[PDB]
Amino acid sequence: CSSDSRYKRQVSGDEAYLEAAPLAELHAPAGMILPVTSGDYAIPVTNGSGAVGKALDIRPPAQPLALVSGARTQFTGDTASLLVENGRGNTLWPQVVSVLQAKNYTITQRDDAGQTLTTDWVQWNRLDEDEQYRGRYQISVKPQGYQQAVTVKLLNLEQAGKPVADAASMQRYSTEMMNVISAGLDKSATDAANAAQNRADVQSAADDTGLPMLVVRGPFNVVWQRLPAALEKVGMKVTDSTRSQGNMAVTYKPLSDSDWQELGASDPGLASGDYKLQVGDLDNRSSLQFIDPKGHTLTQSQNDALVAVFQAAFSK
Amino acid sequence: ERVVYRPDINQGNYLTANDVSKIRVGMTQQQVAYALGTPLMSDPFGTNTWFYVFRQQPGHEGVTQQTLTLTFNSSGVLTNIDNKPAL
Amino acid sequence: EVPDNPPNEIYATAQQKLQDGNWRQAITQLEALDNRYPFGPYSQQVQLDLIYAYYKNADLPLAQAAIDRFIRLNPTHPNIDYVMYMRGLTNMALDDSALQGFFGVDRSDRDPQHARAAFSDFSKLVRGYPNSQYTTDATKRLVFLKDRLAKYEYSVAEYYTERGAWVAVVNRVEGMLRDYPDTQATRDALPLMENAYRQMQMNAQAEKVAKIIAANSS
Amino acid sequence: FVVKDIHFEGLQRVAVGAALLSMPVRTGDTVNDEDISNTIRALFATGNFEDVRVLRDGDTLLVQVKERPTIASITFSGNKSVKDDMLKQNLEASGVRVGESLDRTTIADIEKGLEDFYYSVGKYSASVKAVVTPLPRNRVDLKLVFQEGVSAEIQQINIVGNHAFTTDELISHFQLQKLAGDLETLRSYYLDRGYARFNIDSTQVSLTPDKKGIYVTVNITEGDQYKLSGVEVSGNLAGHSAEIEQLTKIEPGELYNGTKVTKMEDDIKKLLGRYGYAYPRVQSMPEINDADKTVKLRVNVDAGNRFYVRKIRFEGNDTSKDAVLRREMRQMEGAWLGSDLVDQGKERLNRLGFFETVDTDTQRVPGSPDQVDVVYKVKERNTGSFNFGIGYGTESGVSFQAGVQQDNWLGTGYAVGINGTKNDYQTYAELSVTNPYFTVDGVSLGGRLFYNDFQADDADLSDYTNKSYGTDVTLGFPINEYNSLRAGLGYVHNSLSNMQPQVAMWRYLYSMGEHPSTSDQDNSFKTDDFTFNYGWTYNKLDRGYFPTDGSRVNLTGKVTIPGSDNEYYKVTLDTATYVPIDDDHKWVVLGRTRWGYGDGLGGKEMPFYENFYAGGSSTVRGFQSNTIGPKAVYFPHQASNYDPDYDYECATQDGAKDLCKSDDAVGGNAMAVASLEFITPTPFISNSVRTSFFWDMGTVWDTNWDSSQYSGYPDYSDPSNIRMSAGIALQWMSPLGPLVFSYAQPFKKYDGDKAEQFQFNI
């Protein structure tokens, strides 16, 4: 990279403003008043002392991150707090343990009963900074609102040997730890939903407007990932893909009569061309509606017709 | 040496001597305000004082000045009325 | 253009390119992210990081408009101290827009409304949240901004002194003593006032000014 | 029931505290059943939820909440007639836009709304369908099913009641659009022509058989002809009534003109503001006579107060100095509001041309009856230009060039125009450091130091040495607001050698007292000239960058003072005048006119370097630079001691027997060109660009040319040969500078002149 670093943390521009002459106020002559002040622009001194000029770090304060839907991040003192609305606590504590055991941090002490543990030093690898940080953390699971709180407390923080006690870092690296676990739980959940789908029906549906579409098993993300591949067997080559819109575009051609019954369903009888698709999120299912290359939703006929075809595509 | 030309300056108030007549000593600043209007400058420290300068100057015709100084009492009362032309 | 992926991968991208020091790319990632997933779980830290990135890439109008959004929607966020000091910085930095900084020709002639706003914002910051991290440096910046705002006044005063409309002068210096009494600019401004009185044959006031000058001469 | 604590479920996008705040009740408060309903409705008012459920766990109140949003993408499919970019713009002004809370109960309301927006363009049978499709989080995308009707306007427009005016000419004004606007241009047309009791009685709109086109039939009463009986002035006129009578002058039998009335009202206001009365009260009470059909305009006036200016503020001057803007004031800080002086400040500022816009805003000062403040809202437009055209040589050493004028040096006013051109043989350079305000009153001190080292090196000897260098100090004297003068001194040294033999040239050398060969190169002459540079400039243009009205006249002269090896006089005149035809100032007529004349004084001739030349974007378009005018007529030449075969031979003895004519223009001591451009708006952003349709012309000639002696050759002293051209000029303002492009075809082409259709400069 040969960037030399140190630049990202400091303000842009010269420090010349720092040099500015001290505001001396002039003493009043004998028997004369000076309108001492009327307007604003008056200046209060607090003596700080905080960092000034370049020394001051202006990096965006890390925020605790709540990947789970309906998860509260609050930060106070040296503690990052993630609250998640779940059933039981004693089962989530070892999920956390699986995450950290995957990350391989050193465990000085542990306690499944108290659901709390104390780690050895943790070494970070941030590009924005030159001297890497060491963190000692206690991590614990305490249910407070009948939903549990994953709590991270940065016991000892060390910047290249010297123990640090500046404010920002405490947060940034408490939160680093926080975001590490939070991410990890996201990965446990997604890897589990995905693996459960892979290792393991299509059904006709109403869709709230009376128009016809197909509800397929699986969450939005999983179903999305699997959609194009599942769309080779159907005979549609994916042109446009957009998850943030759930809109795919396709250039469909019918396979041969030879090519229909390997899959296991008969032909649906639709004219070849440039169609469009809308995907939707149900917590554990997904919506999928198609539109004529001109631009009109199929009738309940063709719709119900492609259920067998699609459920033949998803047979693994 | 010779003066080819310059644009003309202008100043506030344009006292009409008739307006200078309508005022008498012992007035509150408000009555004064009613006729004389907002002095651009009050003495910052001497006391209550109102300064009325008609200071016209056409281009390269020199400066022509008049100066009306009004000194008030601490209890909001006019005590001194000084009128200058030129000097 | 950014590929279409779940937000989880794209943010990690934007933090590695932000930590890399590569701002234009990071901005691209973040902005794409802010528009496509308007209120994701981490939609706050994205505006924070964008504000930071905008500031470093010197794209100031978008920086302030972003700061201002964050303030409007989150006026009670814990890390508002950062966001406030940013607004202050945004104005102050904006003031020195021209390349004359290279040439070094002095500013303050420039409309310092930006210095005015910067001052306002910083003042808000150090007053409202006095034990913030950025309070001390902000203070240091504030003394400076004061002298700038004083200098705009001194400048206009200087002009009206060469012009000849003395009333404008004594009024502007009057303002200076009222607004920025303890600045070097005001002290430098005192003779221009004295002269102005003498020109209108008002030596009494001129003599008062003379006394004030004599009080702090050096 | 005393609340012990509060808990919430399903919060997602909305924060805990933000909901706690919008709530009327909180912890501790004595709650009964009504308070629950109140706070539930209060949560519903925040417009962020589809459902709110509130119920207690004995004492700990629980808030179950079900969110409504979120719009992330608004996609259109089936739209071709209406752009997406604008559809977006329409939804934003309806509440429902990208990144907002979506309301399920107003779904049909949006559908309906869409169907109504299509009635303007010409679709009355389009049906739309709304698609609500969710996303991973609580988000949703918006796909909109468009089914646009058939394209029909359809026909036609009908008017009932028109006797004075023919329907044809009436319709011809709308097109040169939607109903209210043309109803307004109709109403305006009638009112301007003096039909006051004219009224639009009915607007009948019928449906065509395919029911997607409409038939318009409007009925109106035209009032008779109406003439003004007289203008009566009433109210408090503050003793300035006399001028007001002259403003309220009406022509004998002048027709009632509402806009003339408004014009008059503002004339009066302006007049008053000039004395100081910044905030006047004008009202028009038109009493109508219907028997004689006359109108009496009763006008009530109340001047109010007059003195106001406290401080002047300048906002939007980021590069420029406060001083530079404030110096152009006619209105003083601490003075009478003199609106004339204020708007004259606007004017001076606009004539400077440093801004796209200069705007005046006079604001009252609070607590003070007398004071106001005038602020000048300016928008900087940048000054000057960095540009050059590099490449390409490789047969010759190096094709290098530069050029940059800033017209305002990094916000100082000290306008400089430094330009330079270094070549493998030719070398040129020039400086124009000039400050427009040297004195407080606008004395312009300039100094233009131009110098070019012209080695012209081929044979390195006896080959056209052309060194020259000179300085032009100058001083501008503003006599009035719109006029200024000039006096200054110019020096110039010129070392010329091995002048190729030519008629005019030699004619000049001979009358000088030098007698060189008519076949030999290597003939040298050195000259030191001292000149007096005088001038006078008038400017009353409105704008400085894109002037829409006014006229600029620059007159510059030069005359040799005693002591100069050269003796001549020279006068140059530039005229440009902008004339607008529409009230919007979008269609202009420009009248350019450039002039030049010079001659020797003491039985001498004028130097060929001070010659005038025409051809090119700067003079006449459609022509090669400086090609217009006199051509060179070389004598039977020998050699520069350099004689390689088949290259650069003009009159070389290798095949030359007699005097030779060439294309190489030498230029004349007299000149006149003119232009007539028609400025039109470029389609169609609506002042970032300006285009014109020009008609250019010009002629250059040498008065001392002897037609008697050289009868067998064209007369280079006859002015009637005016080469002409016409075409298109696009003036675009790019960030790298002001660029011009001209494609012009010269119809009047004379021999010796070179053509250049497409021209690009700066």
Q: What b/e string do you get for C93-105 counting C-beta neighbours within 10 Å, with b at 16 or more?
A: bbbebbebeeeee
Q: Is the dihedral of CA D437, D439, D442, D443 positive or negative?
A: negative
C166 touches chain A (CB under 8 A): no
Indicate the DSSP class of residue D210: T
Count structural domains, chain B.
Answer: 1
CATH of domain C1-218: 1.25.40.10
- C29, C3 contact by CB (below 8 A): no
Angle between helices C184-199 and C135-163 in degrees, nearest 10: 20
- C177, C186 contact by CB (below 8 A): yes
The C-alpha atoms of residue D588 and residue D677 are separated, in whole angstroms, by 8
Indicate the DSSP class of residue D331: S
A233's tokens: 């067997």
| D418, containing H or E segment | strand D417-422
Query: Which among D315, D323, D332 has the least Cβ separation from residue C111?
Result: D315
Q: How many CB atoms lie within 10 A of CB D547?
A: 25
Angle between helices D258-275 and D339-352 in degrees, nearest 10: 100
Q: Which residue has the tokens 């009925």?
A: D219
Angle between helices C203-215 and C184-199 in degrees, nearest 10: 160
- Identify all chain A residues contacting B45, using CB atoms and an 8 Å cutoff: 32-34
Residue B3 lies in a domain: no
The C-alpha atoms of residue D755 and residue D624 are separated, in whole angstroms, by 5
- Identify all chain D residues contacting B34, using CB atoms and an 8 Å cutoff: none
D56's tokens: 């207690």
Q: Please provide the distance, in angstroms rounded to a whole number, between the alpha carbons at the two ends of chain A.
A: 46
Resolution (A): 3.5
CB contact under 8 A, B12 and D307: yes
Query: Cα distance from A81 to chain D (closest Cα, Å)?
Result: 15
Cβ pairs bridging A and C (under 8 Å):
160
> What residues does B83 pair with on adjacent strands?
B68
Bridge-based pairing state of the strands D214-221 and D281-288: unpaired
The C-alpha atoms of residue D16 and residue B14 are separated, in whole angstroms, by 65
Classify D514 as helix, strand or coil. Answer: coil
Q: How many H-runs (helices) and E-runs (strands) does chain A carry?
A: 6, 14
A159 shares its domain with A252: no
The C-alpha atoms of residue D152 and residue D122 are separated, in whole angstroms, by 6
Last residue of a domain, one of A196, A215, A248: A196
Query: Cα distance from D314 to chain B (closest Cα, Å)?
Result: 20
CB contact under 8 A, D440 and C171: no
Q: Give the residue among D406, D558, D399, D596 at the shortest CA–CA distance from D473.
A: D558
CB contact under 8 A, D323 and C109: yes
Classify D680 as helix, strand or coil. Answer: strand
Which CATH number do you get for residue D579? 2.40.160.50
C124's tokens: 């808000």
Q: Give the residue among A42, A13, A6, A48 at the shortest CA–CA distance from A25.
A: A42
CB contact under 8 A, D336 and B12: yes
**Rama region for D66: left / alpha / beta (φ>0; ψ in -120 to 50; rest):** beta
Classify D114 as helix, strand or coil. Answer: helix
Query: Cα distance from C74 to chain B (closest Cα, Å)?
Result: 45
Indicate the DSSP class of residue D30: B
Q: How many H-runs (helices) and E-runs (strands) does chain B carry?
A: 2, 3
Which CATH number do you get for residue A172? 3.30.530.50
CA atoms within 13 A on the CB side of A156: 13
- Identify all chain D residues contacting B38, using CB atoms and an 8 Å cutoff: 307, 368-371
Q: Which of C174, C200, C208 to mutate to test the interface with B (most CBs of B within 10 A)?
A: C200
Which residues are CB-contacts of D417 (< 8 A; sequence separation ≥ 6)?
Answer: D405, D406, D407, D430, D431, D432, D448
The C-alpha atoms of residue D742 and residue D734 are separated, in whole angstroms, by 16
CA atoms within 13 A on the CB side of D13: 20
DSSP code string of D606-623: --TTS-B-B-STTS-TTB
- D457, D463 contact by CB (below 8 A): yes
Residue ranges of C 187-216 with Cβ closer than 8 A to chain A: 187, 208, 211-212, 214-216
| Helix segments in D468-604, DSSP class H | 503-512
D18 touches chain A (CB under 8 A): no
C4's tokens: 């279409």
How big is the CA angle at D99 (ends D95 and D101), to the nearest 5 degrees?
Answer: 60
CB contact under 8 A, A50 and C141: no
CB contact under 8 A, B38 and D334: no
Q: How many CB atoms lie within 10 A of CB D153?
A: 11
A174 shares its domain with A226: no
Q: What number of residues does chain D have?
A: 762
Residues of chain C whose C-beta is under 8 A from some C-beta in B?
163-167, 170-171, 174, 177, 200-202, 204-205, 208
Angle between helices C113-128 and C80-95 in degrees, nearest 10: 160
- A84, A67 contact by CB (below 8 A): no
CA atoms within 13 A on the CB side of C131: 1
Q: Which residue has the tokens 């300039």?
A: D446
Distances (CA, A) of A178 to A86, A174, C83, D407: 18, 6, 22, 59
> What residues does D430 pair with on adjacent strands?
D419, D450
The C-alpha atoms of residue D636 and residue D645 are separated, in whole angstroms, by 17
A240 shares its domain with A151: no
- Identify all chain B residues contacting D274, using CB atoms and an 8 Å cutoff: none
The full set of domain ranges for chain C reads: 1-218
DSSP code string of A137-162: EEEEEEESSSSEEEEEEEEEEEETTE
The C-alpha atoms of residue D708 and residue A154 are separated, in whole angstroms, by 107
Q: How many CB atoms lie within 10 A of CB D217?
A: 14
The C-alpha atoms of residue D236 and residue A169 are separated, in whole angstroms, by 73
Residue B48 lies in a domain: yes
Which residues are CB-contacts of D177 (< 8 A; sequence separation ≥ 6)?
Answer: none
Distances (CA, A) of C43 to C33, D483, D719: 9, 62, 77
CB contact under 8 A, D322 and C167: no
The C-alpha atoms of residue D236 and residue D280 are separated, in whole angstroms, by 10
Angle between helices C43-57 and C80-95 in degrees, nearest 10: 20
**Rama region for D193: left / alpha / beta (φ>0; ψ in -120 to 50; rest):** alpha
Bridge-based pairing state of the strands D140-145 and D71-77: parallel
The C-alpha atoms of residue D294 and residue D254 are separated, in whole angstroms, by 10
Three-class secondary structure assignment of D385-414? EECCCCCCCCCCCCCCCCCEECCCCCCCCC
CB contact under 8 A, B44 and C174: yes
Indicate the DSSP class of residue D755: B
- A89, A147 contact by CB (below 8 A): no
Q: Which of B5, B14, B15, B16 to mutate to test the interface with D (most CBs of D within 10 A)?
A: B5
> What residues does C96 pair with on adjacent strands?
none
Q: Is C199 exposed, middle or buried (0-12, 13-18, 19+ CB in 10 A)?
A: middle
Q: Which residue has the tokens 């542990």?
A: A110
The C-alpha atoms of residue D306 and residue D595 are separated, in whole angstroms, by 49
The C-alpha atoms of residue A28 and residue C216 are separated, in whole angstroms, by 9
CB contact under 8 A, C178 and A38: yes
D81's tokens: 């007639």
Phi, psi values for residue D455, rounded to 5°? -65, -35
Query: Cα distance from D369 to chain B (closest Cα, Å)?
Result: 8
- Identify all chain C residues contacting B84, using CB atoms and an 8 Å cutoff: 201
CB contact under 8 A, D135 and A70: no
- Identify all chain C residues contacting B41, using CB atoms and an 8 Å cutoff: 167, 170-171, 174
Which CATH number do you get for residue B31? 3.30.1450.10
Residue B23 lies in a domain: yes
| A268, containing H or E segment | none
Q: How many CB atoms lie within 10 A of CB D437?
A: 18
Query: Cα distance from A123 to chain D (closest Cα, Å)?
Result: 33
Domain range for residue B37? 10-87
Bridge-based pairing state of the strands D60-67 and D6-9: parallel
Distances (CA, A) of D175 to D181, D182, D185, D686: 12, 9, 11, 18
- D619, D608 contact by CB (below 8 A): no
Query: Cα distance from A229 to chain D (closest Cα, Å)?
Result: 20
CA closest to D73 among chain C residues: C36
B62 touches chain C (CB under 8 A): no
- A173, A133 contact by CB (below 8 A): yes
- Identify all chain C residues contacting A67, using CB atoms and an 8 Å cutoff: 8, 41
Distances (CA, A) of D534 to B3, D484, D559, D593, D668: 19, 11, 8, 20, 22
- Identify all chain A residues contacting C123, using CB atoms and an 8 Å cutoff: 40
Residue A32 lies in a domain: no
A76 shares its domain with A155: yes
Which residues are CB-contacts of B80 (< 8 A; sequence separation ≥ 6)?
Answer: B25, B69, B70, B71
- A36, C182 contact by CB (below 8 A): no
Domain range for residue D647? 383-759
- D421, D427 contact by CB (below 8 A): yes
D142's tokens: 């918006």
B53 touches chain C (CB under 8 A): yes
Amino acid at A257: D
Count structural domains, chain A.
Answer: 2
- D557, D534 contact by CB (below 8 A): yes
State the method.
Answer: X-ray
Q: What radius of gyration, in Å, describes the C-alpha atoms of chain C?
A: 23
Which residues are CB-contacts of A236 (< 8 A; sequence separation ≥ 6)?
Answer: A250, A251, A252, A275
Residue B2 lies in a domain: no
- A284, A219 contact by CB (below 8 A): yes
Q: Which residue has the tokens 């530079």?
A: D324
Distances (CA, A) of D329 to C159, D340, D538: 12, 11, 19
Against chain B, the chains showing at least 3 CB pairs within 8 Å are A, C, D
Q: Which long-range contacts (C-beta less than 8 Å, at least 24 apart) are formed by A300-308?
A: A300/A204, A300/A212, A302/A212, A302/A268, A302/A269, A302/A270, A303/A204, A303/A212, A303/A213, A303/A214, A304/A204, A304/A212, A305/A268, A305/A269, A306/A214, A306/A268, A307/A202, A307/A203, A307/A204, A307/A214, A308/A202, A308/A264, A308/A265, A308/A266
Query: Cα distance from B38 to chain C (closest Cα, Å)?
Result: 13
Three-class secondary structure assignment of chain C? CCCCCCHHHHHHHHHHHHHHCCHHHHHHHHHHHHHHCCCCCCHHHHHHHHHHHHHHHCCHHHHHHHHHHHHHHCCCCCCHHHHHHHHHHHHHHHHCCCCHHHHCCCCCCCCCHHHHHHHHHHHHHHHHCCCCCCHHHHHHHHHHHHHHHHHHHHHHHHHHHHHCCHHHHHHHHHHHHHHCCCCHHHHHHHHHHHHHHHHCCCHHHHHHHHHHHHHCCC
List strands edge to edge, sheet with D309-315.
Answer: D309-315, D372-380, D355-364
Classify A260 as helix, strand or coil. Answer: helix
C141 touches chain A (CB under 8 A): yes
Distances (CA, A) of A294 to A274, C54, C87, D651: 8, 43, 51, 76
The C-alpha atoms of residue D200 and residue A42 are separated, in whole angstroms, by 63
A120 shares its domain with A217: no
Residue A174 lies in a domain: yes
Q: Is A183 exposed, middle or buried (0-12, 13-18, 19+ CB in 10 A)?
A: middle
Residue A54 lies in a domain: no
CA closest to B62 among chain C residues: C164
Which residues are CB-contacts of C163 (< 8 A; sequence separation ≥ 6)?
Answer: B9, D327, D440
- D636, D659 contact by CB (below 8 A): yes
Q: Which residue has the tokens 């060469």?
A: C162
Domain range for residue A239? 203-313
Indicate the DSSP class of residue D106: G
The C-alpha atoms of residue D333 and residue D342 are separated, in whole angstroms, by 11
Q: Which of C179, C201, C211 to mutate to test the interface with B (most CBs of B within 10 A)?
A: C201
Residue B1 lies in a domain: no
Q: How many CB atoms lie within 10 A of CB D700?
A: 31
Classify D260 as helix, strand or coil. Answer: helix
A286's tokens: 């997904």
The C-alpha atoms of residue D416 and residue D403 are separated, in whole angstroms, by 11
Indicate the DSSP class of residue D502: B
Q: Give the residue among A95, A78, A59 at the shortest CA–CA distance from A136.
A: A78
Indicate the DSSP class of residue D668: B
Q: What radius of gyration, in Å, describes the C-alpha atoms of chain A?
A: 30
